[PDB]
């Protein structure tokens, strides 16, 4: 019964094609609730879940100003990191930032986090104690020295284990009719011949929330991690998720295979056999 609030930021330089594209999204658990897109018309932080719409004009103004300020910081940092990594001005580069906090079912703070990336690789991260940084390389250590001297971790910590928790608690109350619900996977198996002598068995998990789930194939007790096709968990688009796992088996031996399903919403793990 734990919950999370996370903000994701992406800035992408567009040399000669205008200012960097900037996209910010906020989630509670796996539910998006705010967005900002620099290429969108409104130029405002915008609601994306029904329970955030009740926030007042002061909230939307403040969130819009703060997210625009993040965009302006990233704009500067794109130039700075180009210098640190000795790159030219002609290429497109990417900064990604994620931060947020987890609370338990009783609302207590569990952990906070912040991680930054450059061109899709680790750049700098706040450590779990919220007091020290880990830089990924000698360039990122320049930033670390600057943030250590500016006592950035103390300011960030006050948000991650304080303000972040305050707002997450508020959102969980404001959105209780939806955020507290957990939808169990509906499971079935399908069978698809691929020749006269082999068939694909596919194990399906549908309509589940949250997205975390485990699907496993076993053959006569033993596992088949090397002979299993497993797709990425995917959104249905209605707020639930879907996944499947598949295995090619000899015709007439279907009974030797079992799919195993694990979801937080399942009282017991499900086992399916053809």
């Amino acid at each position: 019964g734990s919950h999370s609030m996370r903000y994701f930021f992406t800035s992408v330089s567009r040399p000669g094609r205008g200012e960097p594209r900037f996209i910010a999204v906020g989630y509670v658990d796996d539910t998006q609730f705010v967005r900002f897109d620099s290429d969108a018309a409104s130029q405002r932080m915008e609601p994306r879940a029904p329970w955030i719409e009740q926030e007042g004009p002061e909230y939307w103004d403040q969130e819009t100003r703060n997210v625009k300020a993040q965009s302006q910081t990233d704009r500067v940092d794109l130039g700075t990191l180009r210098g640190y990594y000795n790159q030219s001005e002609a290429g497109s580069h990417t900064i990604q930032i994620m931060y947020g906090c987890d609370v338990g079912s009783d609302g207590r703070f569990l952990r906070g986090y912040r991680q930054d990336a450059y061109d899709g690789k680790d750049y700098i991260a706040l450590n779990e104690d919220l007091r020290s940084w880990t830089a990924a390389d000698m360039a990122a250590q320049i930033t670390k020295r600057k943030w250590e001297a500016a006592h950035e971790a103390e300011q960030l910590r006050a948000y991650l284990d304080g303000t972040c928790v305050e707002w997450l608690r508020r959102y969980l109350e404001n959105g209780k009719e939806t955020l507290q619900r957990t939808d169990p996977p509906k499971t079935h198996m399908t069978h698809h011949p691929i020749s006269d002598h082999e068939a694909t068995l596919r194990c399906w998990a549908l309509g589940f929330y949250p997205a975390e789930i485990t699907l496993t194939w076993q053959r006569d007790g033993e596992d088949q991690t090397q002979d299993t096709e497993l797709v990425e968990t995917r959104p249905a688009g209605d707020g639930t998720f879907q996944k499947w796992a598949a295995v090619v088996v000899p015709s007439g031996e279907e009974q030797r295979y079992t799919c195993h399903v694990q979801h937080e919403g399942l009282p017991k793990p499900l086992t399916l056999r053809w």
Binding site: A24, V67, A69, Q70, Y99, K146, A150, E152, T163
Partner: peptide, 9 residues
Amino acid sequence: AHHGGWTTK
């Protein structure tokens, strides 16, 4: 609500 604080890199 997200964080209102920014030191550049």
